[PDB]
Design a protein around this ligand. Structure first.
Ligand code: ICS
Ligand code: ICS
Ligand code: CLF
Ligand code: CLF
Ligand code: PRO
Ligand code: PRO
Ligand SMILES: [Fe+3]
Ligand SMILES: [Fe+3]
Ligand SMILES: [Xe]
Ligand SMILES: [Xe]
Ligand SMILES: [Xe]
Ligand SMILES: [Xe]
Ligand SMILES: [Xe]
Ligand SMILES: [Xe]
Lengths: 517, 458, 458, 517
């Protein structure tokens, strides 16, 4: 019926194509089916971005000692200058860091007509001479694949001449239907051209965190806790990452998938090519963090590490429990909606639950059916016309490298225990009964949700934030963390909670109506 | 900070770094929001729309609405005709604007979409409700800058709406250029103080600087009304403030509707504000009232009172050409030196105007660069320091790295609260600028001086 | 800096250090400058008069005229009657005010000079030209503070000038209290926006914030006019803004002329401005117009937009009691905490009002001190830090020593240029304060954060 | 003439009194006699201050490790909080410094009524325990004299109990006719109760700078040069002075008198009591400075001092001659008026002349005939009723410590050679023919001068500054230096010249008239 109320104003054609995007969870339909990762309806005011953003903006950008050159006109570049808050520092205090710059070929009319490959060649050389980075990236924009520029070929010539890797990405913004295609596009070239290539020696308890971009320092907070326990963090893809360290991602025994959507492609291929397994992790929310660390200790199976684990948990939770009780005190019974990208809508749910907040509504901008419904449905997934021309890549066990990190029999008993090895259960199962999912939620939808359910809080992004607050409802951003962080880890929960309480109890919410009414 | 930026300059011809411009469409999206009950539409891939909406939201801390055609590879092959048609139907039915103002991107421009055709087929097919409007401009992002996008959207307003029905409204038209809503309010106050009737367009005041009332209002109270945008053709004269942003639309208005137009600098500082007031007085024969004369005299009093902290100061400036041309003149008026002067927006006028005012003030050895960027200016600073930096938010990195007093100016300013309530134009705006400039200068002095040189009075 | 100030506190009973007040007469001089064609006259030794003129010029960067009786030792023992009589003849002949407004010092008050007698003798002997006036008030510097001096001069104005001639004016009187000319301008603008006739007195707008025209004007364009001062007796109602500064004047006017009066906080912040606006409408039946509603809504919008930076912040405030009571309320309304709250001006009102708003907000452990000083607040800070400091110029020493984001507020501010063109009252002033507060908070954050913690957007 | 014009509007009584305070130099009468140091005419709008300002605010305040307590209501105190820019630093990087504070008994009603000696006593004690300064000073104000508080007694009692000096000053504001009385009152107590009380051994080439208060660093600049040449600056009274160094003031062979009006009393008394001679000095303006340094060299004779003297002068002038030429190129022909306290109207003249500026008008606020006419006229000065109660004190030669520093024949021989030993020629002599002097110039007088003479620049103070500039004429302050400094010394000349040129050439002066006019 809320589904009905949302669909009501859509014209017939739109009503029909949207209906499948909105599902109400019921106990009888425990595993309900949603439509996702389809094209955006024109004119309906989506939040979505493009393939270029998913590739250059999200996955690649954070690699700090690599120069990322946008091949396009100036905006694709300008709009990726610091808006996404991946944190970087010079490695060990001395490594290169280009976070504070954006690089572009600033294409002009001549380039659109006569072609742009000569400006691109020149750009690449200028950047090598000037900066001498570990690598240079070249990123396509909308016009590039239509004017005929061959950026793969251009990168090869230049990389020949200069003596370092030059990675081309064909992430024109019209590819796929969303940022999603850019994730996939980046994963492909990263896998084949960067992972493995590292000549460094593994280490004891070596692990990678995958699909984590160190927004507001999230990753440093994860790492901190991970190291007390004893682990070595061979690599984080790609938050605060160096090029060399991505080359050396293979030097690990366990892959942790924080953002499933953006990085799973690489999770799978690393298992296939190098025989490294992976679990879904959620380093946000105390429940999520503990559950995660408890899971990893098992894959490693180690009385000491396993004990050290439950120790650090104790002193960390000790250190913050007073804060947790405060949040619950000040937030108990509050209601929430979450519309984030393709991961956080779900990963923030346990935290809100421990605050006693009820999540009534959730959705993803650009996630796929497996993020809603879990990976078990992958076999039923039909790639549609709008994503057909996103390339699939195949890898095969590397002989001199491949390994069986977890004996076959052993894997299956961990899965027996509930350890998400090569698995992700999806957002829907974690949600309460009678709640609702809305894929590619648009302005019209959100408004109906706001009138009908009257949440106390609505998490989303910068485009929605003020629309929500103009209506007297608190909206905290869960992409940019409203210029705060970490929100991940144990200290993250404190940060998050204190920000949320402060938002709810801001006095001015009560002063909106003038006394002359 | 900005460690990779070396002092030794190898001149760049291909690699653009930290640009002092952005692309057309956001300028057109901003211009469209200066129409009442208007929904801007981005005709291309949706990444552009989201990015352009986002920067406006980050600057103003306000909603900024727009629809998009959401191109897929399908359009990159069949064009975006079906997309725009499908969009227009969902827009009118879900969101009911009174007018849809379409702009384009590099994608649709590269592809050669034909919006006038699609539009006529929408008219014929019955896709545009009675009492509703759809207009368009073309804004290829590989041409000019966001200033140019604004100029183009304003031209599109004229094409579609401006109508000389022969009547005389008695009004003057004012195209304020690519300035903030605070600047628009202040220009309207001045008109209204001079007791001169006028139509301003675009006008974003009451749109991107609006109240919180507890109800979200998709089309805010402000914006120039369609009926008045029509009525522009019936006006005695058009004042084009800032030639880059505004001239195209004023010229087009003359052609279409026979309304003559005068070009003026964005009114920032003494001579530029004087020139604007004198245009108004001369055009109407009306007297400059006492309130306005008091403001000017307060500004002169301030320029003189604060003189010692301004004389001979070296200023680095980067931004949009209309605004930086005037602000540069004000700098000289203050007794200070425009030492490094840059815009990312291409065009010869910036070059000529800045060169000329420097030559007239006898100032030698300043670097003026058209299509320069923030990397240029930082390299310059490394070779010889300055006393003051004026730019958008992205200057903050240089301000910190080099320890330079910093004044946030122009677009976009995404890191402070309430700046969008303050004009930079007029005598009132000029007074604000001098306070802000001297404040940041005195803050640094009092921070860094020895304790024994610390002072009560300054 | 301020090295001699110890962390460990020993309460002071006698030694006053770095006062949060000054003496009566400058407040009276300021009030008298709020009368048109008036020369303030200080009846004491000329040291007072020079000092009091000086502080006003330091604050406003403007001339500030006053004459003095110039007591010598002889007159300081046997009375100052000849001095003042000599002065009036020299004043009227050389300087030709329409009115001389006399105040006193610790010298003439300790001596018991009888000004009503001196002035009558002066009247009876013809020392006062036809159509010229001389009024007085008594302003002993050992009582209260400069605010008390302001209040006494206002009463003095009422005593000598306010006549109820029966011919009702249909106006509301407003005594704006001890606020700046910008604030008086803002209060008037609001009266005018509401379409309410009014008499404001005193009014230093156009006197202490005037233009440079190239001719020095001894008596500037501004100031409430004598005839209007008289007419105050014929109004329907008097609004007294700020009890310490304005009540005495308002009660006096009721007593003498039977004009009723309501007391209102200095309109700083949401509730105080709301109460001021509600009073104007409730008193006149007048409708609150859209423009004023928009301003309030922009303020609320800003309070919400900026909320994250304000919530829970600890604020130290020192200043004059009317302004600080209102500002402390505003701080609480922004979600922040008035942690240390002090006025140098004696009286229980402050203790009470402040204690009460804290209790109401459920805020515990804040230190409120009446007749506290800057040494007090510094020692407190050394024991438990704060996040923001608001005071006049003399706070800059604490701000620097303790590294606290600092807002210049109230009187006197002697070290910045152009601040006296900005109101702190009204929705418009409130917006300025929120900008200024968040600006100085963010400036510190971005200066001090690690480079990897540096942000584009805030 | 101009004097007639100034006198015109005065009422007859006033005209008669003021006439003698205004004099025009002529060849017919080279050094006319002036009337000075008389009562201020009531209602005339003087610039003058009071005796309390002269004693506490000017002479004593700069003594940085002494706690100065105003006994009075709060204004007298607050108005001495930082307005006069005597610079002070911790002696040796570590000594006490109370520059940043003001101290008060903050008298109330009850104190006027039952007297204030008790609060004073407690303030003294509070100040001592809290700060433990080298000394405490106590300063009377207007009402203190009238109500009869005996402050000398309180100070004695407390000084006994606490074990440090407590110096009482009866500088009620109404004493005398101006700040001058305050100087005298301060000098009296400093001489008898402070100077000579020290116990340090005199060093070689020991000089004192008397009447220098280190406004904006002036004194540190002259020291810088004096210490290069090779002198020992035993003490500066009282710029950046410690209590102890003032006590040790007798440990020198030569006193230099910068401000004659404020410090001449002590200069006379030191020579009488200790035999220490003095010379007028002027460390303002190149010519002033060079002449002063050469005079000091003659008094000491030592030919190394003499050589370093010319070596240091040579290099200093070398370093700044380009600036000096610039000043003269940019100012040549311009005209000035000077009206400063009791010294600077005269001491700044050599600098302006070197810049090519013609000083048309000069005056002092509170100087005496000897500052105008020279010390030769002192035997003819008649103390008038308004200043007769300023205490005169007499000192005798110290039976033990007295000494002939310079053979009396040498003394007379240097006076031949032009050395200003125990003398001062006054401001009039230095002025050009036909110029005008105006004592206690008031607002009326200034306005006539500005209208008639139309000077390019008018130097004065804060009260006059904006009155002048509102009329389109530059006014630079020579008390506060407009929050700059040093203005004394070689570096001072360059600071002053650059500020003056910048003032003259500020573009806004030409923008005053709107274009609709
Ligand atoms: S990559 Fe993705 S939209 Fe997984 S494109 Fe987006 S820094 Fe979001 S919910 Mo912005 S799939 Fe990361 C995301 Fe999540 S940019 Fe960040 S916050 S966890
Ligand atoms: S003491 Fe005097 S008024 Fe000689 S009371 Fe005054 S710090 Fe002046 S011209 Mo202010 S006799 Fe000093 C003076 Fe000169 S306060 Fe300073 S500048 S050289
Ligand atoms: S969907 Fe994505 S962001 Fe859009 S263009 Fe396409 S790749 Fe780029 Fe870059 S310059 Fe501007 S923002 Fe575009 S309109 Fe041309
Ligand atoms: S001439 Fe001088 S400064 Fe004047 S009082 Fe007298 S000693 Fe002092 Fe202090 S408190 Fe204020 S300023 Fe006076 S009126 Fe009483
Ligand atoms: O303040 C300004 O100037 C810019 C112009 C467009 C958006 N705001
Ligand atoms: O508050 C203010 O700004 C003014 C200054 C003088 C009196 N009060
Ligand atoms: Fe907002
Ligand atoms: Fe001024
Ligand atoms: Xe493992
Ligand atoms: Xe939050
Ligand atoms: Xe470039
Ligand atoms: Xe005290
Ligand atoms: Xe000597
Ligand atoms: Xe100067």
């Amino acid at each position: 019926n809320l589904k009905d109320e949302i669909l009501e104003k859509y014209i017939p054609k739109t009503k029909k194509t949207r209906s499948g995007h909105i599902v109400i969870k019921t106990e009888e339909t425990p595993n309900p089916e949603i439509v996702a990762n389809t094209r955006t309806v024109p004119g309906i005011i989506t939040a979505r971005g493009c393939a270029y953003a998913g590739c250059k903006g999200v996955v690649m950008g954070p690699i700090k000692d690599m120069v990322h050159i946008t091949h396009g006109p100036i905006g694709c570049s300008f709009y990726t200058w610091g808006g996404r808050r991946f944190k970087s520092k010079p490695e060990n205090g001395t490594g290169l860091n280009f976070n504070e710059y954006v690089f572009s070929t600033d294409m002009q009319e001549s380039d659109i007509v006569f072609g742009g490959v000569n400006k691109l060649k020149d750009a690449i050389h200028e950047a090598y001479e000037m900066f001498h980075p570990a690598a240079i990236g070249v990123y396509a924009t909308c016009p590039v694949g239509l004017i005929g520029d061959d950026i793969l070929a251009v990168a090869a010539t230049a990389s020949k001449e200069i003596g370092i890797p030059v990675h081309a990405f064909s992430c024109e913004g019209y590819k796929g239907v969303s940022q999603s295609a850019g994730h996939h596009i980046a994963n492909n070239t990263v896998m084949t051209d960067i992972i493995g290539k590292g000549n460094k020696e593994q280490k004891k308890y070596s692990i990678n965190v995958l699909g984590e971009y160190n927004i507001g320092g999230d990753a440093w907070e994860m790492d901190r806790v991970l190291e007390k326990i004893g682990y070595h963090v061979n690599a984080t893809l790609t938050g605060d990452a160096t090029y060399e360290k991505v080359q050396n991602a293979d030097k690990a025994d366990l892959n942790l998938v924080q953002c499933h959507r953006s990085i799973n492609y690489i999770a799978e291929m690393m298992e296939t090519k190098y025989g490294i397994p992976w679990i879904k992790c959620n380093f946000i929310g105390v429940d999520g963090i503990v559950e995660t660390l408890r899971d990893m200790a098992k894959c490693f199976d180690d009385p000491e590490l396993t004990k050290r684990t439950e120790e650090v948990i104790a002193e960390e939770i000790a250190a913050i429990q007073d804060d947790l009780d405060y949040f619950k005190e000040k937030l108990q019974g509050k209601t929430a909606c979450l519309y984030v990208g393709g991961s956080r809508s779900h990963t923030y749910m346990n935290m809100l639950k421990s605050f006693g907040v009820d999540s009534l509504v959730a959705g993803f901008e650009f996630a796929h059916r497996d993020d809603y419904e879990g990976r078990e449905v992958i076999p039923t997934i039909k790639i549609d016309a709008d994503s057909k021309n996103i390339p699939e890549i195949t890898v095969t066990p590397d002989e001199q490298k491949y390994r069986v990190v977890i004996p076959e029999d052993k894997v299956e008993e961990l899965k027996k225990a509930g350890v998400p090895l090569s698995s992700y259960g999806g957002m829907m199962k974690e949600m309460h009964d009678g709640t609702i999912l809305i894929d590619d939620m648009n302005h019209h939808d959100m408004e109906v949700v706001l009138e009908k359910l009257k949440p106390d809080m609505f998490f989303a992004g910068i485009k929605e934030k003020f629309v929500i607050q103009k209506g007297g409802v608190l909206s905290k951003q869960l992409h940019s963390y409203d210029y705060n962080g970490p929100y991940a880890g144990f200290r993250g929960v404190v940060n998050f909670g204190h920000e949320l309480v402060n938002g709810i109890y801001t006095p001015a919410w009560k002063m909106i109506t003038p006394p002359w009414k | 900070m900005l460690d990779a930026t070396p002092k030794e300059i190898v001149e760049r011809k291909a690699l653009r770094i930290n640009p002092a411009k952005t692309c057309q469409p956001v300028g057109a999206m901003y211009a469209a929001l200066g129409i009442h009950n208007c929904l801007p539409h981005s005709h291309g891939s949706q990444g552009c729309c989201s990015y352009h909406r986002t920067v406006l939201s980050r600057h103003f801390k306000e909603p900024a609405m727009a629809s998009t055609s959401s191109f897929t590879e399908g359009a990159s092959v069949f064009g975006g005709g079906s997309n725009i048609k499908t969009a227009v139907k969902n827009i009118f039915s879900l969101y009911n604007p009174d007018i849809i103002a379409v702009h384009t991107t590099c994608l649709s421009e590269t592809l050669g979409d034909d919006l006038p055709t699609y539009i006529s087929q929408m008219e014929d097919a019955g896709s545009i409700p009675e009492g509703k409007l759809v207009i368009h401009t073309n804004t290829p992002s590989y041409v000019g800058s966001h200033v140019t996008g604004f100029a183009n959207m304003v031209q599109g307003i004229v094409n579609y709406l401006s109508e000389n029905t022969g009547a005389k409204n008695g009004k003057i038209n004012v195209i304020p250029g690519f300035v903030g809503p605070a600047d628009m309010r202040e220009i309207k106050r001045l008109f209204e103080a001079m007791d001169i009737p006028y139509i301003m367009f675009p006008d974003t005041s009451g749109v991107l600087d609006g109240p919180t009332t507890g109800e979200y209002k998709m089309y805010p109270e402000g914006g120039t009304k369609i009926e008045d945008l029509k009525d522009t053709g019936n006006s005695d004269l058009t004042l084009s403030l800032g030639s880059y942003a505004s001239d195209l639309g004023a010229k087009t208005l003359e052609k279409k509707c026979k309304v003559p137009f005068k070009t003026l600098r964005t009114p920032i500082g003494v001579s530029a504000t004087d020139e604007f007031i004198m245009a108004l007085s001369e055009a109407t024969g009306k007297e400059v009232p006492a309130s306005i004369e008091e403001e000017r005299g307060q500004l002169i009093d301030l320029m003189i009172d604060a003189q010692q902290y301004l004389q001979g100061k070296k200023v680095a400036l980067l931004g949009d050409p209309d605004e930086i041309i005037a602000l540069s003149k004000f700098i000289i008026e203050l007794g200070a030196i425009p030492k490094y002067v840059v815009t990312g927006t291409p065009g010869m006028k910036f070059q000529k105007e800045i060169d000329a005012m420097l030559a007239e003030a006898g100032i030698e050895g300043s670097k003026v660069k058209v299509e320069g960027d923030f990397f240029d200016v930082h390299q310059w600073i490394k070779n010889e320091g300055v006393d003051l930096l004026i730019s958008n938010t992205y200057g903050k990195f240089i301000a910190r790295e080099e320890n330079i007093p910093f004044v946030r100016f122009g677009f976009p300013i995404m890191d402070r609260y309430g700046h969008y309530y303050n004009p930079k134009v007029g005598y009132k705006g000029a007074i604000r600028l001098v306070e802000e400039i001297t404040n940041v200068i005195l803050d640094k002095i009092e921070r860094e001086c020895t304790e024994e040189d610390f002072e009560v009075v300054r």
